Amino acid sequence: KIRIGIVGYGNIGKGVEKAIKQNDDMELEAIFTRRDINKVDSNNSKLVHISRLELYKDTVDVMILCGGSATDLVEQGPMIASQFNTVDSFDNHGRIPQHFERMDEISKKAGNISLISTGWDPGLFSLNRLLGESILPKGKTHTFWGKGVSLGHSDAIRRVQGVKNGIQYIIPIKGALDKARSGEQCDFTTREKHEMVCYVVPEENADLKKIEQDIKTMPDYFADYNTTVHFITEEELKLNHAGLSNGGFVIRSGNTQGGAKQVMEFNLNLESSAEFTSSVLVAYSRAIYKLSKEGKKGAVTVLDIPFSYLSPKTPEELRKELL
């Protein structure tokens, strides 16, 4: 019954299309692509050009924005929010407060509701940092991002002269993880938590491979981490580096009055990070639907949503089964 519109058809969008199938209370109305009319009519499927978005007014309950680019969302988000309830995974933490403000203004004016920055981080990990912080006010929180891509760092290394294509991985350091879990509590340097490993397909004219170390010295992205670099062929990349898997850990190590060690941990191990993010977007779309019907308007984050809203079961079934 809940009519979902998918905006963008990259990995996340594809994942959302599949996730919707695992939810009986939902239906896919259309998938909106920015690909030009240049196609085989539409290659059939549920694909519809982005220019027709407007035509679906009153036939779509929630527009799930599956674009990967946070920069694009800056403008696309408000545009869509002015016409439909929305759910996005805007992942630029530093710019979240600006995105929230903008989306909030627009959704409120249009009388819709926009959920921003959901997914696993922002999203699930955010919820647990908060939970950990609230339940154990006296302690330390540590977030780790299991072995997987960083996307931004992948494009970052691409802006380096000499590199034609590549990929980077962020990998938690076992030692730091065990320490966090020990409940010993302690601060960590960025270098003590994660290490970085790069795989680059160089050459500009067989370009200087040593200078390619612009990566290691690259401020922000690398330099703060022990970064290893490996050169491979465009062939090895496509076949051996489908960086689809990922995961992470959110650990809260604290002490209750008296020094008693109390440790809380939430973690994810995902063979397909994109598809998981897609499942999260779909579950949250259900909550947005419900809130919308309740008259709620404006922007919200996962922090404002009760978990019961993510489930299609009744408040009675949940108390009897899961409480």
Place this chain on the structure above:
Amino acid sequence: SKIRIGIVGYGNIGKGVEKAIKQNDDMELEAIFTRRDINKVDSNNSKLVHISRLELYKDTVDVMILCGGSATDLVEQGPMIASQFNTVDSFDNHGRIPQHFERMDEISKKAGNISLISTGWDPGLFSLNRLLGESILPKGKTHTFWGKGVSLGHSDAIRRVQGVKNGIQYIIPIKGALDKARSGEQCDFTTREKHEMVCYVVPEENADLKKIEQDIKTMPDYFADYNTTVHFITEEELKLNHAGLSNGGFVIRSGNTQGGAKQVMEFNLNLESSAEFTSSVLVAYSRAIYKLSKEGKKGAVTVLDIPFSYLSPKTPEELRKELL
């Protein structure tokens, strides 16, 4: 303008609650209501107040945290307090939760109050994560294990066995089961595959050790269905190494994507002091109930109905900037 807290019951949880309140600057302990003779319990414990005078505080307590001192009232006097205050309890009888909800809902609505039932780690935090797991990953299985802690019932059971002077029991998740659940391979576990039991017993002089081991192992309803290990120790070791105040647990959702890709979510706890952790949760949720009561929320609610933002003293803007 601090949140005025009230504690009912001065047992381990009540004491833990008093402690936790100290870690929350936005809160203040107004009084601790006990059934004990206050005149006998010192006099400088300023906060102690005899339970008979509870109603005189109907206007000075914002949230009453029920820490039932194991007395029958730890399952019956909830409805009593709800008639006069907004409450928070950790009613842990899962099968009886629906009934408790209805009873508390009617009474709290009638008095224009809000009552939070069944918060803590389980029920409570584990409940939230079971919900999150099946909501995020509708196709898959959920597995809850209970870390390593004592089952008072089983400990009493051990004490009835011939030749047993004293002892204790622990329930412990089996590594193999945890490892398999953590892998994406879906499967349903038998009772015997998920948890094992370990006992530490102090035997009477003579007693027959091999016989005690078997009487415990083959005991119906308590140990018969679980692999059980029996260790024999001295009274000294029992007192020193088995305070039995620690606990933990795991909630794992093992699911698959439409194409069979394995997705695993896990939430777990490792508590050196199970009681004080439960108390901290009770306190955090007390902040949430205060907020919801000022908003005019009426009736009973569970952790499932409360957004995590209500558990924090920080502003919404502050949260979105620091933690989101």
